[PDB]
Amino acid sequence: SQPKSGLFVGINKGHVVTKRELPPRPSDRKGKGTKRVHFVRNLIREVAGFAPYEKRITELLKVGKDKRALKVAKRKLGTHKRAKKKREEMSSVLRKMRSA
Amino acid sequence: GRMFAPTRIWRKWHRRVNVRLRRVAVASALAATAVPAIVTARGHRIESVPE
């Protein structure tokens, strides 16, 4: 981002050197979901089904108790960061199932 | 049996001297040769050497 302040102390301290903007690299798209792999994962999601904790999270959301859904998702998955996004994905899967 | 306190390879075989002290010593080694009296007293036969 914009260069340093030039003074050895303070907010954004250091020596002024003119900054340069780095052209994108591979692994800047690392994990960007793609059409075919979304296809593959969709299909096997439907063919295989849901795990029991996934089903219990569906039930907690179709009741609406999102705090408890997060809490059980955390106790299974292990970390808040994954629990919140598994809850987010099950909210996705439940809205896309009430859509029709 | 053993010997008392058997010698070990990690004695201090090499000693260090300050590089400037080596230079001092070699300068004072040179400066003493330029003397016929000390070259003689050190044992060399210098009685026909010209200068």
Binding site: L7, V9, G10, R20, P23 | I9
Partner: protein, 205 residues
Amino acid sequence: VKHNNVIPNGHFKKHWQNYVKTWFNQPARKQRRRIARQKKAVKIFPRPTSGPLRPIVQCQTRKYNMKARAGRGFTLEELKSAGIPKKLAPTIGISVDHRRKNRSLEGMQSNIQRLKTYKAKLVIFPRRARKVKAGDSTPEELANATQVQGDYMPIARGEKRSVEVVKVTEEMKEFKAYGKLRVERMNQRQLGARQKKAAEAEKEE
């Protein structure tokens, strides 16, 4: 222990006599390395003995940030902007480092300058005898090439000590630099409370 001394701290309770490392092979190490260097030079005649080129980079770490030193390789961006392809720089004696990042035009242009100088003073023999293709060099040029030895590009480690003499302007004298230095320490200490007070202005105000 006994009379006033520094408190002992010898780490000599394990079986250290099983792991004493004595260096009596040190001169032979030196001689072996020298023979190794000599025979590497003979095999790589007439390539420079220093090996491939290296970048000027800055050191890390506040203690050493101001001292330039040699790097591992020029980034892809330098090798591209110098007209020296990725796959071919190690071929003509220029290292390549895919991992570095350039954040400053100053570093990038300095390393371009090293690349350009090297490509000016590089001579390359043809892959075959009579077939001189692009990138090679003339026979009369090739006939005078020797094995350059030591550091054929020295990197000055830090900027030269110049202490010139200038005017002492009053706009320079009036500057309270200690007060300056304390004020942004205040800015850093208070950046928390100031932005909290600010954000609540949006929340409520």
